[PDB]
A paper describes a structure:
Except for an N-terminal region, Prp3 is highly conserved from yeast to human and contains a C-terminal domain of unknown function (DUF1115; PFAM ID PF06544). Here, we showed that Prp3 orthologs contain a C-terminal U4/U6 di-snRNA binding region that encompasses a DUF1115 domain and a preceding peptide rich in basic residues. Our crystal structure and targeted mutational analyses demonstrate that the DUF1115 domain acts as a ssRNA-binding domain that specifically recognizes the first 10 nts of the U6 3′-overhang. Our results indicate how Prp3 functionally bridges U4/U6 and U5 in the tri-snRNP by Prp3-RNA interactions on one side and Prp3-protein interactions on the other.
Numbering used by the authors: 332 to 466
The structure:
């Protein structure tokens, strides 16, 4: 019997190709010393964000993700072949789970692209988190 000190919030997004959005997610997780991860299915696919830490930091991060980042914002994308105008009008972010953990298996905060949905689920599985993803 021990206290439960870790808050946790989980978000799912449709597209995370905007490098400016990735930069904000990464830098705020780093500056807030949040733990968790951000996974998506292929470069241009849907994915999940999990953050774990204290209450204050998780609430700041929710406001960042749900209110301050413009997920629907068009941008120009630089690829191996050229530069293209991306249409993001259909992009969106949802908060799914929120709650408390007694312990977390996360080591820092990390971003990864997975090759398929099953790869993503397998990865969440290593952190006991596979249930957090809605296919």
């Amino acid at each position: 019997e021990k206290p439960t000190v870790y808050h946790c919030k989980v978000f799912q997004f449709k597209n995370l190709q905007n490098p400016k959005i990735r930069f904000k997610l990464k830098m705020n997780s780093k500056e807030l010393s949040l733990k968790g991860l951000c996974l998506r299915i292929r470069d241009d696919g849907p994915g999940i964000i999990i953050v774990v830490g204290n209450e204050k930091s998780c609430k700041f991060y929710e406001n960042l993700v749900m209110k301050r980042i413009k997920w629907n914002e068009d941008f120009e994308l630089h690829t191996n072949t050229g530069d293209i105008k991306m249409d993001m009008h259909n992009n969106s972010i949802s908060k799914t789970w929120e709650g408390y953990l007694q312990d977390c298996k996360f080591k820092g905060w990390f971003m990864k692209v997975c090759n398929d949905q099953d790869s993503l689920l397998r990865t969440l599985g290593q952190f006991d988190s596979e249930h957090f993803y809605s296919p």
